[PDB]
Amino acid sequence: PAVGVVTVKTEPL
Amino acid sequence: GADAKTVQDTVTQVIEQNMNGIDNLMYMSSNSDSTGTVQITLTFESGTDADIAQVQVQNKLQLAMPLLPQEVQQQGVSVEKSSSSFLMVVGVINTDGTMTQEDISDYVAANMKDAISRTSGVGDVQLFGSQYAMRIWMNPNELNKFQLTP
Amino acid sequence: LKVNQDGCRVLLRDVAKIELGGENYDIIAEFNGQPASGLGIKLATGANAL
Amino acid sequence: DIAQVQVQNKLQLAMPLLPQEVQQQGVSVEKSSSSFLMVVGVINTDGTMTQEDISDYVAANMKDAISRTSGVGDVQLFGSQYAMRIWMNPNELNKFQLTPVDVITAIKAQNAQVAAGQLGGTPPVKGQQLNASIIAQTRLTSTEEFGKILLKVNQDGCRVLLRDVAKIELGGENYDIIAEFNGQPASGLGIKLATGANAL
Amino acid sequence: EGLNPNAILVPQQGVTRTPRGDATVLVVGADDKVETRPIVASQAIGDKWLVTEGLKAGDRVVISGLQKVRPGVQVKAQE
Amino acid sequence: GMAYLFVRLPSSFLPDEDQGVFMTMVQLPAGATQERTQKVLNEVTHYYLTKEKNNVESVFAVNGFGFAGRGQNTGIAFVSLKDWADRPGEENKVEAITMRATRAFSQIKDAMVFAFNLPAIVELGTATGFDFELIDQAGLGHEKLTQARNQLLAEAAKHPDMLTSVRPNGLEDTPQFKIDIDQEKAQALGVSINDINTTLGAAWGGSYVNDFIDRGRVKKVYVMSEAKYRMLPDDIGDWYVRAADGQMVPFSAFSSSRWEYGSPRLERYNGLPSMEILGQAAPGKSTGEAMELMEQLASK
Amino acid sequence: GAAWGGSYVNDFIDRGRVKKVYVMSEAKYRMLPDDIGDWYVRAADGQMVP
């Protein structure tokens, strides 16, 4: 079963 | 403003601790909310009107009236008897959409809705909507600007 | 609203926004593409239908 | 019921005419006939619990599902609910120059319940993702929470907690009735006849 | 603006105050059966939330499907 | 053998025959806003309008409302049809429409949404669902009643042979935000807490005051500041309060705060602490069998 | 009458139960007619007055 999977990119502040 | 805990205590346990000497139910049910609309549902024995036990319970509620938070009864409390059956839904909307759903709501509500209630055969017209109000939007920079409190 | 001894008047519009108001704002109800207003009707006991 | 609601609704006409305080307590507008039925007693035969404790035990615990039983008139509580009972000392009030009225003003001032709201109710801003409810000052539960209720200070912070002048305990809403059943009090419970009750 | 650019800013959606007095966020596992990790969620920033604890860029955090899924169910990724 | 066929026959109640509409229940996960919910309603609305042009003759959904609980994660679509004569064919009958709807719901992500027909006398349930409440008589913690509850939802999932949905109406304990105040800080400010809170729920719950007239119409007065001003916990810190001296005071001068749980929709049944336990049985098994099952699991 | 007839104030919760609040001093402190003189009240200056 498929899931909406959103993944981290945290470069600036 | 208040929570389901305040619902339970300041309102609902007032009722439960006053739903006493109560007559001819089949049972009773209730729920809470954070929004504030408490609802108690009271399934009663058949063969009778709603009105006798209605005024029983709502008059021990009249015994319960100063026990309320003053604020909600300053707003008012719906203590109603209604069988929960609809009649129909009524579709009222500016197809242009230039007016808000509030605008239509108080439009019909002030204007039209009431003479429907001045017509035969009515239970409740559910106003999906409300009256207008004097809605006000503060600024802490302005209170702060003039060193004030709301 | 408040002043000083000059009488620098303060107005409610100067601090806040004035408009009409939903007592709540909670139901965005929609019917056929546009959000629509709705009016329930319920039954009168002992009345007719037809 | 007809003349009942006649008279109790001209009593509804008569409501603000009362002293406000007794209707802050309430009025026993009661239609009932004077017909008893069984007044069921219980007692800790040790007597470790007071008659108040038994009364609040049933009244909180037992009494109400008896009221959830068929055919019931009144469930008569020969007794009462627990409460908060406080016993002052004018030596200590006088020691800190205390009016108990202002003590009550603090009692309301910290006891009361605060309606708060939510973290951005309707309508929020566009693009808002989160609303939840603001949680705020609560009506209190423990007698030590009650006991730590702040009273006057000095400028250093030489504070006054609660009681410190007084006494916290459970409150008999009166203390006036002494029943006794054979060496000790008990809990007799008046299960009175309902009007239309069906007894056997 | 501003200080050190490395700053774990996840939007508010997966942010769970879980449990009592605590705050975790559930990530998927590497074998698609999901894998919650408790994290020090710092101050919310914008539509997002600062995290100090543990997580890196590229960590397979979720959005949508968290309710049919408990730890132990494989997952096919979507954005 | 007549008696054999007599006893072997299953039973039911009065059927959900046609209504002309169907009732469309829409449920989202908690914490999600009415904006995201609104997006969802636009999606589902777009499905039954656009991908179901051929029969769909009505829409009306209520964003924010739930008859199962008036919260931000629910919405209802009132969906009518054409004339009966304008819908010939068994796929043009309401049940199969709901079956394709369920296939769409399986297709729909980020949701717990199902439509159905109500009873003809709608005050009865789902007509396959028993209503089941469960109440701790001893006051053993609503949260621990929820432990034993969802524990018994796991147990309720241990018998798929019995049920078709063991689902509750559980509106979940929420992340939520308690703000604590020091009185000795407050008395160090010497300012009445009641009016601080009056300021608070005035600005953070909103304040009714009184009424007026437009065109002969008594109307309410409400006041609470801007959405951008009522959005953050740090927005809490923005609010300054005059004290006995006349100084403007942040809440953060005296306010701590933290998070926790708490469910918005609590329930008490016959005045007794309850949680809504719906359930429909698998077809071919009576609900009294489900009573024997869950009541022997009420041993647990 | 707060201290000589008792003083109800308001209520609270124990274990989900709204309960009354009373206050009046000790039996030995509420017994004599002379005990009336034992009570002192802040005047306009805030000074305890028998």
Cα dihedral B129, B132, B138, B143 in deg (nearest 10): -140
Which DSSP category does E45 fall into? E
What gap in Å lies between CA F119 and CA B5, rounded to an integer? Answer: 33
One-letter amino acid for residue B114 of the chain: D
Q: Is G4 helix (H, G, I), strand (E, B) or coil?
A: coil
Chain E CB contacts of F175 below 8 Å: 15-18
Tokens representing residue D103 in the block: 């003590």
Instruction: Answer yes or no: are the C-beta atoms of E34 and E69 closer than 8 Å.
Output: yes
What resolution, expressed in A, was reported for this entry?
6.5
Please report the residues numbered 68 through 87 in chain F whose beta carbons come closer than 8 angstroms to any beta carbon of chain B. Answer: 69-70, 78
Q: Can you give the length of chain B in residues?
A: 150
Task: Specify the amino acid at residue D71.
Answer: G
Residues from chain C contacting residue F226 (CB–CB below 8 Å): 17
Nearest residue to B129 (alpha-carbon basis) of B113, B111, B109, B112: B109
Within a 10 A sphere around the Cβ of E38, how many other Cβ atoms? 14
F267-269 vs F273-274, strand pairing mode: antiparallel
* CA F111/CA E2 separation, integer angstroms: 38
Pairing of the two strands F267-269 and B25-31: antiparallel
Interface of B with G (CB under 8 A): 8-9, 13-14, 17
SS3 assignment for chain F: CHHHHHHCCCCCCCCCCCCCEEEEEEECCCCECHHHHHHHHHHHHHHHHHHCCCCCCCCCEEECCCCCCCCCCEEEEEEECCCCCCCCCHHHCHHHHHHHHHHHHHHCCCCEEEEECCCCCCCCCCCCEEEECCCCCCCCCHHHHHHHHHHHHHHHHCCCCCEEECCCCCCCCCCEEEEEECHHHHHHHCCCHHHHHHHHHHHHHHEEEEEEECCCCEEEEEECCCCCCCCCHHHHHCCEEECCCCCEEEHHHCEEEEEECCCCCCEEECCCEECCEEEEECCCCCHHHHHHHHHHCCCC
- Contact assignment for B10 to D113 by CB distance below 8 Å: yes
Question: Which of C20, C23, C27 to probe the F interface (max F CBs under 10 A)?
Answer: C27
Helix (H), strand (E) at residue D65: helix D63-66
The Cα F46–Cα C33 span in angstroms is 8
Q: What are phi and psi of G11, to 5 degrees?
A: -130, -175
Q: Which of D67, D115, D118 sits opposite B6 (nearest CB)?
A: D115
Separation of alpha carbons F254 and D150, rounded Å: 15
d(CA G39, CA G32): 12
> What is the distance between the alpha carbons of residues G16 and B8, in angstroms, rounded to a whole number?
9
Terminal-to-terminal C-alpha distance of chain E:
30
Identity of the residue numbered F168: P
Q: How would you label G6-44 residue by residue, b for 16+ Cβ within 10 Å and e otherwise? A: bbbbbbbbbebbbbbbbbbbeeebbeeeebeeebbbeee
Pick the closest to residue E26 from F147, F31, A6 (CA basis).
A6
Kindly list the distances between the CA atom of residue F177 and the CA atoms of D134, E21, F221, F231, F233, in Å, as whole numbers in the listed order: 6, 10, 28, 13, 9
Residues of chain B contacting residue C43, judged by C-beta atoms under 8 Å apart: 83, 85-87, 123
Helix axes of D100-111 and F193-201: crossing angle, nearest 10 degrees: 30
Q: How far is CA F115 from CA F54, F101, G33, in A?
A: 18, 7, 76
Among residues F291, F298, F296, F297, the alpha carbon closest in space to that of F131 is found at F291
- Structural tokens at position B48: 């009778």
Structure tokens at D31: 């239609």
CB contact under 8 A, G17 and B14: no
CA pair distance C33, F41, nearest whole angstrom: 11
Cα–Cα–Cα angle for D77, D175, D48, rounded to 5 degrees: 80
- Cβ-based contacts of D108 with chain G (< 8 Å): 9-10
**F107 to chain A: nearest residue by CA?**
A2
What is residue C18's three-state secondary structure? strand
- Which chain D residue's Cα is nearest to C24? D122
Tell me the Cα Rg of chain C: 23
D131 to chain E: nearest residue by CA? E12
Is residue F240 less than 8 Å (CB to CB) from chain B?
yes
At residue F8, φ and ψ (nearest 5 deg) are -80, 0
Q: How far is CA D150 from the centre of its chain?
A: 22
CA distance D53 to D81: 8
- Which of F248, F272, F274 should one mutate to test binding to chain B, selecting the residue with the greatest count of B CBs within 10 A? F248
CB B31, CB F265: distance < 8 Å:
yes
- In this complex, the residue of A2, A7, A12 whose CB is nearest that of residue E60 is A7
B72 CB within 8 Å of a chain C CB: no
Enumerate residues 6+ apart whose C-beta is below 8 A from D145: none
| Residue of F224, F243, F247 whose CA lies nearest to F235 | F224
HSE-CB of E14 using CA atoms within 13 angstroms: 28
User: In the numeric block, which tokens belong to residue F102?
Assistant: 């369920």
Of residues G26, F220, A3, the one with CA closest to residue D163: G26
Asked if F264 is an interface residue toward chain B (Cβ–Cβ < 8 A), one would say yes
Tokens found for residue B150: 């709301």
CA B135 to chain C, closest CA, distance in angstroms equals 5
C40 at F interface, C-beta within 8 A: no
Q: What angle do CA D108, D109, D114 make, to 5 degrees?
A: 95
CB D94 within 8 A of CB G48: yes
From the CB coordinates, do chains C and G have 3 or more pairs under 8 Å? no
Judged by a CB distance cut-off of 8 A, whether residue F35 touches chain D is yes
Of G9, G38, G42, which has the smallest distance from its Cβ to D108's Cβ?
A: G9
Decide if F26 contacts F61 (C-beta within 8 A).
yes
Instruction: Report whether F276 contacts F169 (CB < 8 A).
Output: yes
Question: Which helix or strand (DSSP H or E) is residue B28 part of?
Answer: strand B25-31
Assess contact for B124 and B85: CB atoms under 8 A.
no
Question: Experimental method for this entry?
Answer: cryo-EM
What is the C-alpha radius of gyration for chain E, rounded to an integer number of angstroms? 13
Residue bearing tokens 């054409």:
F82
Which residue's entry shows tokens 């609902």?
B12
Chains E and B touch each other (3 or more Cβ pairs < 8 A): no
